Symmetry: C3
Subunit: 337 residues, 3 copies
């Protein structure tokens, strides 16, 4: 398309919402291609990542870890206004794995504090894709400080399975998984720092171990639990988009399955089916579709169970509905031998 | 099925067999859905896992690491009687990744020492699936103490390739791969403990490094090598089911291939073919089908070769038959 | 085929070239099966792997890390003459993941310094496959000393997508990714040694931590950058073969994609499409096909960004051509 043709396209301004929720969208595209407009302000902020009060100097798109999910359709243009407020200290940019050229957009979006930029790219391929900051020479430090998220490029005809049949979810959640590398003192307690810069050298040492101290969903140990637990009902069809910008993960819905899993995150690659645990390589997003069949509490985890249960990578679902004894029943409840 | 239909289904008791062997089953299901009944007793016991006398306080379904492979067909029910003898000291349960609801069954099967429980679930999806103990708040500790196994839910018409042509194996082995995290004193010598709980804090410290001290098949370094190598013959079709309940693995048959590999372990997902090394993510089982073409010793490994050859993740196959010079020949033997 | 039949087949001698380049070949097979002949001399040499002068005692097929890519077609015979010069200190051999029998050839190719051998195997399965040295009892040591490479067995009709469409590349590059485990002194300075055997014990200690000190393409940090950046033009179709003989990797073309990715490396397993980041388990090779659409610098990385940008797993492409503003444009350049 020519500059003139793109200029003639409808514009739609979208208000982003904080993960794990996703902004209003239509699964099947409404009309022809549009220029979908998003704005995000970058916040360098202290966040607490566990119940002990452990701190990270986060670098957060839209003030959240992960950054919010942007949703467009194939062949729409994504037009992002990215703002680096003067209160920040570092240059930042954005790389969209969905985009083609200039390192994903990073080469064209390097903004110092007090600056902004607008990047437009054509979303040519359907799927879920990571985005993240990547300042040359400082790439993993920004990413493992939380400066990453994902986008979803839906097919114009909405989701389908591997074999032509339409798949329509009732609700969607975005689980961003984050590996953090928090320095420890001599007694093994996590260190605190006044400025982000003070943490750099110590953090790089931990990064080099390739062993995170924390692996978390939505920015903190237990972030998606309690009154923040995800919710569903028996019969409800849920799409769970999961991203990991730096490190492998192996999602698993404990008590459920991934009925259809685009493990590679790409909708033109047919989904795996009936999955127990799927695999998303670092630097990628994946998506799983499931119809809940049983009520009760589920844990959604990275199924390295040390990562899940020691390091923080566990969320909960609360599911309403009627128990199905055909699917599972306690024939004899725990009782003396 | 309605209540009366479920109640009317045949019930069949099956006797289990320790890994890497697999209990009696038919690949093609005989008659309709059945309630297939298994019993396992949980054993807590010290096991030695290497040639230096290194001990783990194992928590073992049916007394083995891994727990035994249970085999059913799609739309059968699996009905497990799980027993926790009063001689044990810990509460245990069971989560079947094949099952739906109550965390996989764990919510319904919490048994203290001196208790038993009976869980039934409908095996709705075909594949190999992990099962493991998962007491709330102590999940990885039970799992990396060896309290995990797998099941196979065969399609009612047996296995097929991507074109629906039948794949029938002559034999099946189950390789359960276990990451262990054994504490060491400050001289690097592995520590011993009187009771499993005494090792808890020290073991969690090792677990948090995400670096196993041992990675083993069938519960110990060399358990499936030497006089305990698995066997086959040239022309024989073998299914190798492989599980890892906590940590990634990358199986490889050295000298062979995975002709068909259900890498995700799920039979409705078409198998990969002609595989050199497949990948099974932590918390899953996979299955590879191979027809042996050459006699001799094979090694079967996790192809992180440090894990295979330094940490213990190496098995052997001893294969009989006639060498095939078309496939491979020594044109010039090693010579000066 | 019979020995007589094989003896009657055309021979072709191939001259290998250093990675990331690949020797001249045809994508669509030239006539019936051939015996394709390769020769490689093994060189034990010091390599410098970072800008701090860090040394590894490499064990290098054809003098390079990785060893060179050998290209044959399905049902050709690959016939390798492998030479271990008297200037070396260790026994070496070769295992082809593409081959069947004798551990992939290692059982038939054990050569001491001053010896040579000739191995012929039938390339029965199409795809990219790792090869590596594997001396019994010293396997990971040789592999993580850089003694590994890959081969490509092309379908006789060349590459295709999952649905019968031909895929013809204009350029091919072979990226061999290497995990190294370099000992450090009390001050964290990397240690140097004056013989390969001298480094063994210290190196094994590091290997057992499962944490590489370096993760590199083509034997060193920055190797495939600057004078060695890979090149292309807008419109050009490029195949990138990637191997890792010991450890997982997750390749990613920064600024591009994997349009078709044989993630398992096996051409009879349909390629994944539109890939952002793909996954190759340790002990395997994979291949990605991409048509460049934008000019400029791309980074090709292992997308654990710590491994890419702290440990060394980053390469570049320099691509010529016209910028496409439809695909991407700066609507407002960085500004107040
Ligand atoms: Cu990236
Ligand atoms: Cu589990
Ligand atoms: Cu190998
Ligand atoms: Cu940033
Ligand atoms: Cu247990
Ligand atoms: Cu060697």
């Amino acid at each position: 398309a020519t500059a003139a043709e793109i200029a003639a396209l409808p514009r739609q301004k979208v208000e982003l919402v904080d993960p794990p929720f996703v902004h209003a969208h239509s699964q099947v595209a409404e009309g022809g291609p549009k220029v979908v407009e998003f704005t995000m302000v970058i916040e360098e902020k202290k966040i607490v990542i566990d119940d002990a009060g452990t701190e990270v100097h986060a670098m957060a798109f839209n003030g959240t870890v992960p950054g919010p999910l942007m949703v467009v359709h194939q062949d729409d243009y994504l037009e992002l206004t990215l703002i680096n407020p003067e209160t920040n200290t570092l240059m930042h940019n954005i790389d969209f794995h969905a985009a083609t050229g200039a390192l994903g957009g990073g080469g064209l979006t390097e903004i110092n504090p007090g600056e902004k930029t607008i990047l437009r790219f054509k979303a040519t391929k359907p799927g879920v894709f990571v985005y993240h900051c990547a300042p040359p020479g400082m790439v993993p430090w920004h990413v493992v400080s939380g400066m990453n998220g994902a986008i979803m490029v839906l097919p114009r005809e909405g989701l389908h399975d591997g074999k032509g049949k339409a798949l329509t979810y009732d609700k969607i959640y975005y689980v961003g998984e984050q590996d953090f590398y928090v320095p420890r003192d001599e007694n093994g307690k996590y260190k605190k720092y006044e400025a982000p810069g003070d943490a750099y050298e110590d953090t790089v040492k931990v990064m080099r171990t390739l062993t995170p101290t924390h692996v978390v969903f939505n920015g903190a140990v237990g972030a998606l639990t309690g009154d923040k637990a995800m919710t569903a009902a028996v019969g409800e069809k849920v799409l769970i988009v999961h991203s990991q910008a730096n490190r492998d993960t192996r999602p698993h819905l404990i008590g459920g399955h991934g009925d259809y899993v685009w493990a590679t995150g790409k909708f033109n690659t047919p989904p795996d089916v009936d999955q127990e645990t799927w695999f998303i390589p670092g630097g990628a997003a994946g998506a799983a579709f499931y119809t809940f069949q049983q009520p009760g509490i589920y844990a959604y985890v990275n199924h390295n169970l040390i990562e899940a249960f020691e390091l923080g990578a566990a969320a909960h679902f609360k599911v309403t509905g009627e128990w199905n004894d055909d699917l599972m029943t306690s024939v004899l409840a725990p009782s003396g031998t």
